[PDB]
Amino acid sequence: RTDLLNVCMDAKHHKTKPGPEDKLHDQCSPWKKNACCTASTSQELHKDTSRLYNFNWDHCGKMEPACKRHFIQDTCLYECSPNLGPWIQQVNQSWRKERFLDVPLCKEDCQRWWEDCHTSHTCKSNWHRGWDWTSGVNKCPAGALCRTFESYFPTPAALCEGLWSHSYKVSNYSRGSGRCIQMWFDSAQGNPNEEVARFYAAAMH
Numbered sequence: 263r264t265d266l267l268n269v270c271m272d273a274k275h276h277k278t279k280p281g282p283e284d285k286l287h288d289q290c291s292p293w294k295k296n297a298c299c300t301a302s303t304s305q306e307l308h309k310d311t312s313r314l315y316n317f318n319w320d321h322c323g324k325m326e327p328a329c330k331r332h333f334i335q336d337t338c339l340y341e342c343s344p345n346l347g348p349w350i351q352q353v354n355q356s357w358r359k360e361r362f363l364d365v366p367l368c369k370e371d372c373q374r375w376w377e378d379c380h381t382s383h384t385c386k387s388n389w390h391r392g393w394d395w396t397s398g399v400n401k402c403p404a405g406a407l408c409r410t411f412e413s414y415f416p417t418p419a420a421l422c423e424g425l426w427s428h429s430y431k432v433s434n435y436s437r438g439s440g441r442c443i444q445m446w447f448d449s450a451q452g453n454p455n456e457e458v459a460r461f462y463a464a465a466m467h
């Protein structure tokens with residue numbers, strides 16, 4: 263229960279423990295009061311093919327800004343959230359010992375993400391496994407054609423749930439209900455996802 267709260271997962275860049283980061287860059291700044299990412303990490307993850315994982319979002323031509331902002335926001339959450347304890351799973355990968363499974367993403371966040379990416383393209387419905395890495399950057403592998411986002415993600419859930427091997431599940435709860443993790447939030451009344459982590463930590467027990 264409580265041991266799942268306010269933790270950082272054992273992954274490539276994560277800090278060991280949550281802590282204030284007043285200099286979090288741009289989109290990551292709402293995490294500045296309590297975060298699992300360093301300022302350095304937040305700065306780098308905004309860049310195209312950043313040194314974080316050498317991951318290229320423009321693998322099928324340039325990805326539109328309206329769409330890119332969501333992938334950037336998603337990376338901020340992955341790298342900076344101290345509130346995903348309840349969904350942390352043990353995996354034995356070379357670059358992380360842990361990851362998330364079935365984080366209850368607010369349906370609107372997923373809907374908006376999916377909608378904003380319609381004009382963009384990709385060659386894969388899962389961005390976690392199957393890329394051609396031989397060049398040092400992910401490239402479209404054999405058998406993978408470039409298509410519109412909707413071809414590979416026919417619905418919002420296909421995007422949010424398929425993208426990183428089910429790191430998210432789409433929650434039927436809405437933004438501000440306190441019953442789902444929000445990707446996008448202002449920290450006016452603090453981080454809305456603490457309450458959420460606290461709720462499921464107990465509810466999933």
Ligand SMILES: *[C@@H]1O[C@H](CO)[C@@H](O[C@@H]2O[C@H](CO)[C@@H](O[C@@H]3O[C@H](CO)[C@@H](O)[C@H](O)[C@@H]3O)[C@H](O)[C@H]2NC(C)=O)[C@H](O)[C@H]1NC(C)=O
Pocket residue numbers: 434
């Ligand atoms: C996900 O959440 C939404 C609510 O945000 C759920 O929608 C509601 O579903 C019920 C039926 O299961 C709808 O009810 C039918 O509604 C009409 C009234 O408009 C009523 O006359 C019928 O007797 C019947 O109850 C209800 O309208 C709908 N809510 C809204 C605001 O439209 C949905 O069920 C949830 N999904 C799951 C899988 O739980």
Ligand SMILES: Nc1nc(N)c2nc(CNc3ccc(C(=O)N[C@@H](CCC(=O)O)C(=O)O)cc3)cnc2n1
Pocket residue numbers: 315317336337340355356362389390391392393394395426429
């Ligand atoms: N929940 C969540 N949210 C994110 N934003 C997120 N972003 C990334 C981006 N960083 C990546 C790093 C490595 C790979 C990689 O080496 N893939 C191999 C699999 C084999 C292996 O494991 O080596 C392949 O292509 O076959 C792919 C992506 C990764 N996970 C994420 N998870």
Ligand SMILES: [Cl-]
Pocket residue numbers: none
């Ligand atoms: Cl807008």
Ligand SMILES: [Cl-]
Pocket residue numbers: 354355356
């Ligand atoms: Cl693996």
Ligand SMILES: [K+]
Pocket residue numbers: 342343344345453455456
């Ligand atoms: K959070």
